[PDB]
Coordinates of C-alpha atoms in Angstrom, one line a residue:
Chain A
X215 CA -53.5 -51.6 22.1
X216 CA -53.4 -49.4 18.8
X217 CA -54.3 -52.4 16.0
X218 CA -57.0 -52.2 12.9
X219 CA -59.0 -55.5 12.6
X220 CA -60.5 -55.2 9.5
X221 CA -61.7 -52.5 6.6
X222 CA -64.8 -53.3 4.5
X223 CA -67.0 -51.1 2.0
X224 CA -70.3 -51.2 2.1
X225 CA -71.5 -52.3 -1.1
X226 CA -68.2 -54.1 -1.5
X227 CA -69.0 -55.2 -5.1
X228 CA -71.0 -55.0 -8.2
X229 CA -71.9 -51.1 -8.2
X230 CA -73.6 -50.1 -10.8
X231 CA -75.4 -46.3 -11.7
X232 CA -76.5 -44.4 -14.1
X233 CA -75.5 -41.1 -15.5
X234 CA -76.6 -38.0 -12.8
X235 CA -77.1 -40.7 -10.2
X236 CA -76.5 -40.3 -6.6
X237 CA -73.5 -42.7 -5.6
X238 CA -72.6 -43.8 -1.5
X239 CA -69.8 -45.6 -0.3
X240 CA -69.8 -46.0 3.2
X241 CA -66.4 -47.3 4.6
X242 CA -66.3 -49.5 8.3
X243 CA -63.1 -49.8 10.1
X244 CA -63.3 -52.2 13.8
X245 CA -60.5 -51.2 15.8
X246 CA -59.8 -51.3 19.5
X247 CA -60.3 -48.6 22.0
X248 CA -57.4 -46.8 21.8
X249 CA -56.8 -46.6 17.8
X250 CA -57.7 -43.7 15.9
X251 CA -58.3 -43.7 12.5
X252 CA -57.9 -41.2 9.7
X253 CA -60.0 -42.2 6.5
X254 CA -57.9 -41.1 3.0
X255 CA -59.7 -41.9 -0.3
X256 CA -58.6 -42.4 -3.9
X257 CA -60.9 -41.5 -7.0
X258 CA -59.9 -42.0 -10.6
X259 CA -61.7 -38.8 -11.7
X260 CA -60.0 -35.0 -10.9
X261 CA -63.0 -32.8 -11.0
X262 CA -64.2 -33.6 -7.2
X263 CA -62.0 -32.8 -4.5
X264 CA -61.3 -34.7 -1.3
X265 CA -63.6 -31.8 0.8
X266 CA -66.4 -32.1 -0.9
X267 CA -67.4 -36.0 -1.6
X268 CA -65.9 -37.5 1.9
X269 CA -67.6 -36.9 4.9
X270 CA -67.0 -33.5 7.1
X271 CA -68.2 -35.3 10.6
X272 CA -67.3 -38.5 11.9
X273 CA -69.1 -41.7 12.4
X274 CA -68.2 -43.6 15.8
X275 CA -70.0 -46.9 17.5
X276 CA -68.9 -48.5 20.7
X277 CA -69.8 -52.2 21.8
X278 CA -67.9 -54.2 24.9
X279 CA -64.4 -53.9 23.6
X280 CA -64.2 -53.1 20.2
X281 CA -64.6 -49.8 18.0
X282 CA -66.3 -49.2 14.4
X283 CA -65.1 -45.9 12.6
X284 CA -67.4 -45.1 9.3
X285 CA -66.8 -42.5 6.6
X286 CA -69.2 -42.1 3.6
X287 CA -68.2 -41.0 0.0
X288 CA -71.5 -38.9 -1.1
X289 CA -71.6 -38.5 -5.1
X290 CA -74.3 -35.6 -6.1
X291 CA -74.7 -36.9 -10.0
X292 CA -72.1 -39.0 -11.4
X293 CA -70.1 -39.1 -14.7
X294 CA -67.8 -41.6 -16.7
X295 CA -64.8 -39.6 -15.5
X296 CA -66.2 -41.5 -12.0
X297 CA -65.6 -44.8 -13.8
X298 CA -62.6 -46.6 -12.4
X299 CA -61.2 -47.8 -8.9
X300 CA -62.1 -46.8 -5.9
X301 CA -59.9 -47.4 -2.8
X302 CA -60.5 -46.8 0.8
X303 CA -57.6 -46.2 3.0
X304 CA -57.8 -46.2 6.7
X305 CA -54.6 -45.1 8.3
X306 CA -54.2 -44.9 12.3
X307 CA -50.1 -44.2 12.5
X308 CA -48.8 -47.7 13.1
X309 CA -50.8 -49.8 11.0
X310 CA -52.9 -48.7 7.8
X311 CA -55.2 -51.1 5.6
X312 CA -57.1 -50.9 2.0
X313 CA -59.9 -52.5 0.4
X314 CA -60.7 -52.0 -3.3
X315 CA -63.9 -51.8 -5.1
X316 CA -64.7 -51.6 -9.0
X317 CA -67.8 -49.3 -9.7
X318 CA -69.3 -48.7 -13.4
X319 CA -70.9 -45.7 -14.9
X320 CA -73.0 -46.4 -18.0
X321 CA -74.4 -44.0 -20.8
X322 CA -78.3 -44.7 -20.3
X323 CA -81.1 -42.7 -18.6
X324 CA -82.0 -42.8 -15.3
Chain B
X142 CA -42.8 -54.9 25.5
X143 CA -39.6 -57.0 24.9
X144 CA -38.8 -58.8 22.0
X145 CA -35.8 -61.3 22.0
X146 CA -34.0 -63.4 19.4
X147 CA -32.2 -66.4 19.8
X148 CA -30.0 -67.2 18.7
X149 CA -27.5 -64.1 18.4
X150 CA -25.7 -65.8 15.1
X151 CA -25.8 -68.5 13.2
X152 CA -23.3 -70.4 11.2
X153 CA -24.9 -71.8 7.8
X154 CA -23.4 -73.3 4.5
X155 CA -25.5 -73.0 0.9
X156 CA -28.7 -75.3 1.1
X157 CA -29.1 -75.7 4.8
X158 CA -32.1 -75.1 6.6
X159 CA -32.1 -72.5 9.1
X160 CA -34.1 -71.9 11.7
X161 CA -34.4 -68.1 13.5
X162 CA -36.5 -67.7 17.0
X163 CA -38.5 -64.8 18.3
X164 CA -39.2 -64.6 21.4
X165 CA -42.2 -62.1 23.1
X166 CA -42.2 -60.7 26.7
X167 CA -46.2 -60.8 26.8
X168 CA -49.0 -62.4 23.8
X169 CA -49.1 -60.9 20.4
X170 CA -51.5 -63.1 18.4
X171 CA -49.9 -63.7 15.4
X172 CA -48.6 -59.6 14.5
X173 CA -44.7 -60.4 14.0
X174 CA -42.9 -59.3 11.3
X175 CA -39.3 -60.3 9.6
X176 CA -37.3 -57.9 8.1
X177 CA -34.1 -58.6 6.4
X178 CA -30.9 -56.4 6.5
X179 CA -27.5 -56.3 4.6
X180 CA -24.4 -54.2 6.0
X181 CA -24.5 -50.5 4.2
X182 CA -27.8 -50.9 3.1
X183 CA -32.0 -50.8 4.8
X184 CA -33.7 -53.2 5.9
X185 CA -36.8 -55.2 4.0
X186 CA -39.7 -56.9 4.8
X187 CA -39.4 -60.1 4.0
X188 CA -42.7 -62.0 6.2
X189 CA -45.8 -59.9 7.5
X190 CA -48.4 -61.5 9.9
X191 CA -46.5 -64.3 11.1
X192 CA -46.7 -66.6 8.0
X193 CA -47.6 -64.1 4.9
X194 CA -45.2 -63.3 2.5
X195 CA -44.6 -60.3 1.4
X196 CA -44.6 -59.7 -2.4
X197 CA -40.8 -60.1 -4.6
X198 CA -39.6 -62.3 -1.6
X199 CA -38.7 -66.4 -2.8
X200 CA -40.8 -68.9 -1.8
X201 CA -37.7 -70.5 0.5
X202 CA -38.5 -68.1 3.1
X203 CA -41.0 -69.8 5.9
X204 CA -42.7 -68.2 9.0
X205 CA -44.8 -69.8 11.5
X206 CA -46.2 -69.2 15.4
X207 CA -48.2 -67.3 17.8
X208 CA -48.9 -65.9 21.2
X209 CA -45.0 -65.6 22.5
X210 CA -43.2 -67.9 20.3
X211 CA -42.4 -67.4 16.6
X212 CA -40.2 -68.6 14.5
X213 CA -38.4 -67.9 10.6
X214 CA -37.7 -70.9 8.4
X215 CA -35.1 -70.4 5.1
X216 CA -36.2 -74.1 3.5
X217 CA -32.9 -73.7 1.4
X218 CA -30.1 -71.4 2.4
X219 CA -28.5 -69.2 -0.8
X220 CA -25.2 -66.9 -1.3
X221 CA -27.9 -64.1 -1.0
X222 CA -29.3 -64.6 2.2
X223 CA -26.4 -63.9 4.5
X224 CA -28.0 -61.6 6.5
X225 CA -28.8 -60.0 9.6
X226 CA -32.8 -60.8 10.6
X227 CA -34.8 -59.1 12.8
X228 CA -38.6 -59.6 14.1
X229 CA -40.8 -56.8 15.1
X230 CA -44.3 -57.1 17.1
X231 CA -47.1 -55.1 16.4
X232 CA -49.6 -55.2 19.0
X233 CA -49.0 -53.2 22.2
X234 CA -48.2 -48.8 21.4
X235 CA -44.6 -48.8 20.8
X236 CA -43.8 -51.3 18.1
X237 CA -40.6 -52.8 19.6
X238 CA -37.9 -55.3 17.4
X239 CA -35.3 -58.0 18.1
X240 CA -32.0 -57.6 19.0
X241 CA -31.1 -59.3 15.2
X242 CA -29.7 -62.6 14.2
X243 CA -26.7 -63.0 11.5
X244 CA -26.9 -65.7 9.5
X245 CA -23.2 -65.6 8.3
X246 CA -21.2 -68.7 6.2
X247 CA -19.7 -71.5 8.8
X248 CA -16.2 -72.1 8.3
X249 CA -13.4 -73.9 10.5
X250 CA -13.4 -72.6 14.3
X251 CA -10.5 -70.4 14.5
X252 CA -8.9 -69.1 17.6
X253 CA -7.7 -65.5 17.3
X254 CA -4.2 -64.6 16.8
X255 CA -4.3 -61.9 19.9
X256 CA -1.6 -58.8 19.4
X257 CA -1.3 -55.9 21.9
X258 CA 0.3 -53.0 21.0
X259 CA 1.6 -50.1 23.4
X260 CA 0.8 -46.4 22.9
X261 CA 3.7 -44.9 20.8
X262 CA 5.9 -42.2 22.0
X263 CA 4.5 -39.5 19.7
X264 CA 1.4 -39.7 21.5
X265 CA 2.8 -39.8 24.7
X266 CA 3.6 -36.5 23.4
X267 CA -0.1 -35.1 23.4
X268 CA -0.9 -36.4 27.0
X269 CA -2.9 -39.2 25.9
X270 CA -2.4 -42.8 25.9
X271 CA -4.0 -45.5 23.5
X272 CA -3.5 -49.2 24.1
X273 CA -4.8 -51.7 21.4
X274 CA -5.5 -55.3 21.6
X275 CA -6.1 -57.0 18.2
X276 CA -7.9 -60.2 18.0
X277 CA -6.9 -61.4 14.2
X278 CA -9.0 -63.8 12.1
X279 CA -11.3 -65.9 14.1
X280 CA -14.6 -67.6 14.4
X281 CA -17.3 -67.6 15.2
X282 CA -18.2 -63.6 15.8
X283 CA -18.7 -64.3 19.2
X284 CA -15.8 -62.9 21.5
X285 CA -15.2 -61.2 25.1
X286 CA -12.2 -58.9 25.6
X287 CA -11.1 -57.7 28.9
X288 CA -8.8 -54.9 29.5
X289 CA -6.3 -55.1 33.1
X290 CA -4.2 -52.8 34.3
X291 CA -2.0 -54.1 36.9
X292 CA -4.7 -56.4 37.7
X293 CA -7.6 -53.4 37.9
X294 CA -10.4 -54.4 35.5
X295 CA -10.9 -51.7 33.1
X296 CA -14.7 -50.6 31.8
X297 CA -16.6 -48.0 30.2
X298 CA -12.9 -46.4 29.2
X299 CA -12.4 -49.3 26.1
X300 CA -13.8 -49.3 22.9
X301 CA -14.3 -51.7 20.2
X302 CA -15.4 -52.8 16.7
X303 CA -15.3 -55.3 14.7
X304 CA -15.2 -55.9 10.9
X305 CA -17.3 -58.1 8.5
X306 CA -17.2 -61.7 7.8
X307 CA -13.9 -61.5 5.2
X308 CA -14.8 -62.0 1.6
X309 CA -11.6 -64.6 1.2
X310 CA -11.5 -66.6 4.6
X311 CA -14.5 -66.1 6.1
X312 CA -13.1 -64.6 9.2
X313 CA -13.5 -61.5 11.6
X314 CA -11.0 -59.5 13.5
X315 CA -11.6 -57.5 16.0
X316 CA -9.9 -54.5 17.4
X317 CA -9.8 -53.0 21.0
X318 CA -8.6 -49.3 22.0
X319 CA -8.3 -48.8 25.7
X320 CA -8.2 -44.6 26.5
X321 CA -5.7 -43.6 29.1
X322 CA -4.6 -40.4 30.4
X323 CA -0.4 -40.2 29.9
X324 CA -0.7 -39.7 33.9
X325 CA -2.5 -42.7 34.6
X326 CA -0.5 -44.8 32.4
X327 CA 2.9 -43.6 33.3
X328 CA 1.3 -44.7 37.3
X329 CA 0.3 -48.2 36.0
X330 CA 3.3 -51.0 35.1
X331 CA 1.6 -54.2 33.7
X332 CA -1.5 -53.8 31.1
X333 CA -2.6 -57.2 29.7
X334 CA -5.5 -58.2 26.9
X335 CA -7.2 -60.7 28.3
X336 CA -9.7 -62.5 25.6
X337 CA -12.2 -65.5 25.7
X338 CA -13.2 -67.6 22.6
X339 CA -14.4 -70.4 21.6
X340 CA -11.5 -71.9 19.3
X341 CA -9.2 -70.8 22.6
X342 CA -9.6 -74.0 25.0
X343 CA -8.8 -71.7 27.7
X344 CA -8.8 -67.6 28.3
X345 CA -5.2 -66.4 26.2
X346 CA -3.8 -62.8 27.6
X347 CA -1.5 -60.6 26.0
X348 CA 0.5 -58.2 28.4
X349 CA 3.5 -56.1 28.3
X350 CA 5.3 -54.2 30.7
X351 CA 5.9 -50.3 30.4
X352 CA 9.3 -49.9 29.9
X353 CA 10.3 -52.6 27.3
Chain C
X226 CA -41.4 -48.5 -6.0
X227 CA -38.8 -46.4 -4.8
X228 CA -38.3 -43.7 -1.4
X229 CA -35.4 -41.0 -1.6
X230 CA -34.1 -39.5 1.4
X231 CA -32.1 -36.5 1.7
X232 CA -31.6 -33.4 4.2
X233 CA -29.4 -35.5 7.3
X234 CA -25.4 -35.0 7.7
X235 CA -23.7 -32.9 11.1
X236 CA -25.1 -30.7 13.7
X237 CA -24.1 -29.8 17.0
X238 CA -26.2 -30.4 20.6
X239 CA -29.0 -28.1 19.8
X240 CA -29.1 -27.2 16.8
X241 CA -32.2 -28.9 14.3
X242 CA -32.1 -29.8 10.1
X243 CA -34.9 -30.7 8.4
X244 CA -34.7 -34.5 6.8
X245 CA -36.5 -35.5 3.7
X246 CA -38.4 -38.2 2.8
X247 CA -39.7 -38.3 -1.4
X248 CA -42.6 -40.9 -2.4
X249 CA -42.8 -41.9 -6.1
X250 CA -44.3 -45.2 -7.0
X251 CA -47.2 -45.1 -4.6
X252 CA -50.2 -43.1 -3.6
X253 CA -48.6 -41.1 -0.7
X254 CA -51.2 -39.9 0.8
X255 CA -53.6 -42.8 2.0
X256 CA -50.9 -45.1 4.0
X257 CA -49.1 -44.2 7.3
X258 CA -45.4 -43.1 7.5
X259 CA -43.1 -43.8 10.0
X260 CA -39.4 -43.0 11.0
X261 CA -36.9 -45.5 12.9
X262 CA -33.3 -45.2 13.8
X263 CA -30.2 -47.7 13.8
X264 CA -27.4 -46.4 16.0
X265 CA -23.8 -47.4 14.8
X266 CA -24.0 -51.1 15.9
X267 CA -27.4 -51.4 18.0
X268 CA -30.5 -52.6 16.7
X269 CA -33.5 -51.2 15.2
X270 CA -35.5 -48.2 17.1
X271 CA -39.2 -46.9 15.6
X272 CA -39.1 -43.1 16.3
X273 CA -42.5 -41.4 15.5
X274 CA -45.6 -42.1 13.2
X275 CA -48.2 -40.4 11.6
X276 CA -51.4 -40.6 10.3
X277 CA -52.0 -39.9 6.0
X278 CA -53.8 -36.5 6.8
X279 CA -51.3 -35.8 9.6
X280 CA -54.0 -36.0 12.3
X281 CA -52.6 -38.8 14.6
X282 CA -48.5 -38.5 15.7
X283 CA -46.4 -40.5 18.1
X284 CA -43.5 -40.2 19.7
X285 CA -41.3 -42.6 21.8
X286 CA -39.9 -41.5 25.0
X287 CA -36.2 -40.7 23.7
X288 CA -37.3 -38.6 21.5
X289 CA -41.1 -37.0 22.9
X290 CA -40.9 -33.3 23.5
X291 CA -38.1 -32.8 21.3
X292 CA -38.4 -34.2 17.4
X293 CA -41.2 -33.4 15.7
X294 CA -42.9 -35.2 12.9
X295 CA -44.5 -33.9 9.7
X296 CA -45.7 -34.4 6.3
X297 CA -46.7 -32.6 3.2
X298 CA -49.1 -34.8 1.3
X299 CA -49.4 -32.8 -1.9
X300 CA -45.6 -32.5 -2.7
X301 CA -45.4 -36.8 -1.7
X302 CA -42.2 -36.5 1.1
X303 CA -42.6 -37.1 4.6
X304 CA -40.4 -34.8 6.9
X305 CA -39.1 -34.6 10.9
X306 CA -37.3 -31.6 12.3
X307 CA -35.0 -32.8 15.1
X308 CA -34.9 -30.0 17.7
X309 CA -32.5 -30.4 20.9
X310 CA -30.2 -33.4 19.5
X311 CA -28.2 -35.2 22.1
X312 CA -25.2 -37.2 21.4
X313 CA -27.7 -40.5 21.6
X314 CA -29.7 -39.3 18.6
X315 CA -26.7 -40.1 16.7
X316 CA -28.1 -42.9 13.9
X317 CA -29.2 -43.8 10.5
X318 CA -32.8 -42.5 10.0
X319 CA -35.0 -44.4 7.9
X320 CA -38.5 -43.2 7.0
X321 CA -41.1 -46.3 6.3
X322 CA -44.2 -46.7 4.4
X323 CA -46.7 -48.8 7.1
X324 CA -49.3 -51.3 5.9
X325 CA -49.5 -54.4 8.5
X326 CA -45.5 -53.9 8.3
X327 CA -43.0 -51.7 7.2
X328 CA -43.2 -53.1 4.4
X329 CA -40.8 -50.0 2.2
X330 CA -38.5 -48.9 3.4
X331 CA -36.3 -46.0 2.4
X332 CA -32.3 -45.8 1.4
X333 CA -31.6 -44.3 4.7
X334 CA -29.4 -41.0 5.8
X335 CA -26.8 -40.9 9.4
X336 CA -27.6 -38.3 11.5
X337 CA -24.0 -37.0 13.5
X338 CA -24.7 -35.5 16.5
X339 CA -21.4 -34.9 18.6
X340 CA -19.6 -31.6 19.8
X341 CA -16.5 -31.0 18.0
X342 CA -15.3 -28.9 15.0
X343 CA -14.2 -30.4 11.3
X344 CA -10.8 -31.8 12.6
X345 CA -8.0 -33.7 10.9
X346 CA -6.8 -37.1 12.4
X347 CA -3.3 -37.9 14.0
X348 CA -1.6 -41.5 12.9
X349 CA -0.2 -43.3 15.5
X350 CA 1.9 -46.3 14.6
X351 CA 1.2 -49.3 16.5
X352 CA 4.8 -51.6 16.3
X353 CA 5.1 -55.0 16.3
X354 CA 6.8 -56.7 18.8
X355 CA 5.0 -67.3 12.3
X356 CA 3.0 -63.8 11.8
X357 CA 3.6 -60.6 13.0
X358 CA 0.9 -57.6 12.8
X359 CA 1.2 -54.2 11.9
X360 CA -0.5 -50.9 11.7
X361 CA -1.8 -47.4 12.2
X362 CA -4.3 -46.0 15.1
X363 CA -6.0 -43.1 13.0
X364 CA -7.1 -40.9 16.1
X365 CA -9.8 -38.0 16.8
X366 CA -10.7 -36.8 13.6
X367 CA -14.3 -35.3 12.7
X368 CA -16.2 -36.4 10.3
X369 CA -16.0 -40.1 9.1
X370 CA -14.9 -39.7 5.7
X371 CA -11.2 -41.4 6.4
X372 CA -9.5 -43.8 3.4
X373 CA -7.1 -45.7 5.0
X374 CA -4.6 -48.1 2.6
X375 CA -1.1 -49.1 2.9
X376 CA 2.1 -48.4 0.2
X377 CA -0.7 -46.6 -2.2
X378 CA -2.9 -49.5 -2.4
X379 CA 0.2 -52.0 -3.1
X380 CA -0.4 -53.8 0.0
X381 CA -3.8 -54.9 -0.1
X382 CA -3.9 -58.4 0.8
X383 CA -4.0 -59.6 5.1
X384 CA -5.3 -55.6 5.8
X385 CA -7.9 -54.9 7.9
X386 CA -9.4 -51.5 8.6
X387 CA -12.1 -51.6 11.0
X388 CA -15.1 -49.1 10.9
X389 CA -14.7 -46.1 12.9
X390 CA -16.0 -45.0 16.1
X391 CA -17.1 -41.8 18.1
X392 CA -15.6 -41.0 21.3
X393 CA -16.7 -39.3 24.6
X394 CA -15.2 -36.5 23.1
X395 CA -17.3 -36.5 19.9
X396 CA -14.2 -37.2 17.8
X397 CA -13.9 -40.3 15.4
X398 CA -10.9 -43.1 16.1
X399 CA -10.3 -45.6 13.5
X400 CA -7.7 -48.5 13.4
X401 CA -6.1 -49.9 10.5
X402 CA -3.9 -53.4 10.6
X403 CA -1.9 -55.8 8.1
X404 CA -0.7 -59.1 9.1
X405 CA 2.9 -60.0 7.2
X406 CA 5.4 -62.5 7.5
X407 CA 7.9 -62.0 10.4
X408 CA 11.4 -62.5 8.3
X409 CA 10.0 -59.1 6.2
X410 CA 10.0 -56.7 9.1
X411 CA 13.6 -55.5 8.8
X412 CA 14.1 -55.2 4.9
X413 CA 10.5 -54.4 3.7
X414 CA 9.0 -50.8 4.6
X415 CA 5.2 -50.5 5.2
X416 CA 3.3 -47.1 4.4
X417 CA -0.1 -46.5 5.6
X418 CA -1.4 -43.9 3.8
X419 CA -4.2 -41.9 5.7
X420 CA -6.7 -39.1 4.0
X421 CA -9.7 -37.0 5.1
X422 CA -10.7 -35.2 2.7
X423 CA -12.8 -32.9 5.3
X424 CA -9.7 -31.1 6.9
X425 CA -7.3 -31.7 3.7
X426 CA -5.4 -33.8 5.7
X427 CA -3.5 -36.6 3.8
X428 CA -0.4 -38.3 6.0
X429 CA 1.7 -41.4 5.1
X430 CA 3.0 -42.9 8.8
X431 CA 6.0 -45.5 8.3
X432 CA 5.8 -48.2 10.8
X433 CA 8.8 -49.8 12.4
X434 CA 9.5 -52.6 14.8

């Protein structure tokens, strides 16, 4: 009883900012009861580290038989170095799946 | 959470279509792997999630099934795929795998020519005894080798291994080392190889008598 | 995509090395690693896993309370000290990269766990008594590197060395064997020429009817 059903991003696609604007990606995981998950991003820029955009706490839910695990990306202002791919990794030891998104970061005023 | 294969080998010629079983103890869904292994070197995934292939592998490979039964498809066998395959579940804790199935290259059955060879004097020296019992060029792979000393079965004081399907003749041999003490076999008069295959209509034994 | 391993090779019951595991090729540190074992002959065993920021680890039951996992994520390896080895942890150790499968998997490295000393091997002759077979019984030697051909590599053709195996003892036994025609035995001479290069120990055993 330690399987990963399904990781999705929340918005999945289309992301668009402007530059200095505050960017969230939230990151659901269903799994069952047992599974633990352990959420590992991957940013294109290399200014921001992994302890200060991802999330410090945790975000659990439960409902009958099935468990949602959710870990937000908070971006305070963003940049063009931010342009690129963003992935989402959610690894629980025997199993770990990845769901890609494409966000864009234009040179206009917000 | 058991996971067994069936069969344990399989004899195949270039462009056959094979066909390798997985069997589960208890329901998986549709989490079975197939992994695909050569002698010397690791294995590789070769199907993931039942019936998705994984990327680099040929088209030729096949997988289908759910709940307890499962099953790997090679649409058109090639000098490549010779292989030992093994499933592996991923649903309960413990990911468990299969016991393995070779896929090896058919050939004519062959009985094996069966030799049995006393332990020299210079070991008799060192106050141990070794008896071997070759089983030369035969197939299939599959073969049972009983050691008996003056009628005693013998177990747990043999050991045995077996070498890959030849590159000329397609054939194994086997070889079988029984351990005695120089005490125990200087006691014991009759020691006899006694081996069952399939191109053998009936059980052959080799013995000999200590003294000649 | 590629996985190095290094770090494995002899110890004796107790004792513990660290083994190795490099990533290049991937992002190491957003999948799972695992490790699983092949013993000489058996079938595939998964060993432990762990999490990408090392926060979940299992263990099976042979080895729970004794090998312990680990992983370095900035320097991309994956690592597992093996503390209190028993002469069933003997095997080729394989670290894997997990995504739905184990879907890379590395070059492997064999593991020897078994009591004795570096020891050179004694060649018995096994006699003969259409064809007729020959050979030599290569016996308790320690560890497995042993070349084994017969009248310096002149006699190659119906020879069959068979892979080696570990005693009770902890000691390797290998047997090596060459089919010839029966008429032969009396005029032509057959060398097999033995070598392990661990204990310096090279020996050419004549066999005779």
């Amino acid at each position: 009883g330690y399987r990963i059903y399904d990781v999705v991003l929340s918005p999945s696609h289309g992301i668009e900012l402007s530059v200095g604007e505050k960017l969230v990606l939230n990151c659901t995981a269903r799994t069952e009861l047992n599974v633990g998950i352990d959420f590992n991003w991957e940013y294109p820029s290399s200014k921001h580290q992994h302890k200060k955009l991802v999330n410090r706490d945790l975000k659990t839910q439960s409902g009958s038989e099935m468990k949602k695990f959710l870990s937000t990306l908070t971006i305070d202002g963003v940049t063009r170095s931010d342009q690129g791919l963003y992935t989402c990794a959610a690894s629980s030891g025997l199993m770990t799946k990845k769901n890609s998104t494409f966000v864009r970061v234009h040179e206009k005023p917000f | 959470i058991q996971m067994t294969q069936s069969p344990s080998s399989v004899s195949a010629s270039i462009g056959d279509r094979v066909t390798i079983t997985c069997r589960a103890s208890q329901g998986i869904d549709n989490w079975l792997g197939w992994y695909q292994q050569k002698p010397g070197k690791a294995p590789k995934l070769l199907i993931y999630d039942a019936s998705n292939l994984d990327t680099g592998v040929p088209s030729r490979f096949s997988g289908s099934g759910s709940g307890t039964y499962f099953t790997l498809t090679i649409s058109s066998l090639q000098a490549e795929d010779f292989a030992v395959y093994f499933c592996q579940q991923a649903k309960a804790f413990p990911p468990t795998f299969g016991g393995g199935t070779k896929v090896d290259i058919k050939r004519t059955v062959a009985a094996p020519s069966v030799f049995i060879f006393p332990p020299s004097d210079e070991q008799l020296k060192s106050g141990t005894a070794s008896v071997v019992c070759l089983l030369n060029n035969f197939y299939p792979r599959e073969a049972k080798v009983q050691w008996k000393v003056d009628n005693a079965l013998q177990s747990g004081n043999s050991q045995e291994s077996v070498t890959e399907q030849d590159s000329k003749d397609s054939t194994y041999s086997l070889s079988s080392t029984l351990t005695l003490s120089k005490a125990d076999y200087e006691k014991h008069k009759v020691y006899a190889c006694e081996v069952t295959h399939q191109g053998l209509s009936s059980p052959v034994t080799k013995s000999f008598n200590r003294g000649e | 995509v590629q996985l190095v391993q290094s770090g494995g090779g002899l110890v004796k019951p107790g004792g513990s090395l660290r083994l190795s595991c490099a990533a290049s090729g991937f992002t190491f540190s957003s999948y799972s690693m695992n490790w699983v074992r092949q013993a000489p002959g058996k079938g595939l065993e998964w060993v432990s896993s762990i999490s990408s920021s090392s926060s979940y680890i299992y263990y099976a039951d042979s080895v729970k309370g004794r090998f312990t996992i680990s992983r370095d994520n900035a320097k991309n390896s994956l690592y597992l000290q093996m503390n209190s080895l028993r002469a069933e942890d003997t095997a080729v150790y394989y670290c894997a990269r997990v995504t739905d499968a184990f879907d890379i998997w590395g070059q492997g490295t064999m593991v020897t766990v078994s009591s004795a000393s570096t020891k050179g091997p004694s060649v018995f002759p096994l006699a003969p008594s259409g064809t007729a077979a020959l050979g030599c019984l290569v016996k308790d030697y320690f560890p497995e590197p042993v070349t084994v051909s017969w009248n310096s590599g002149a006699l190659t053709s119906g020879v069959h060395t068979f892979p080696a195996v570990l005693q009770s003892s902890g000691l390797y036994s290998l047997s090596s064997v060459v089919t010839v025609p029966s008429s032969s035995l009396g005029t032509q001479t057959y060398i097999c020429n033995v070598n392990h290069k661990p204990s310096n120990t090279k020996v050419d055993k004549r066999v005779e009817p």
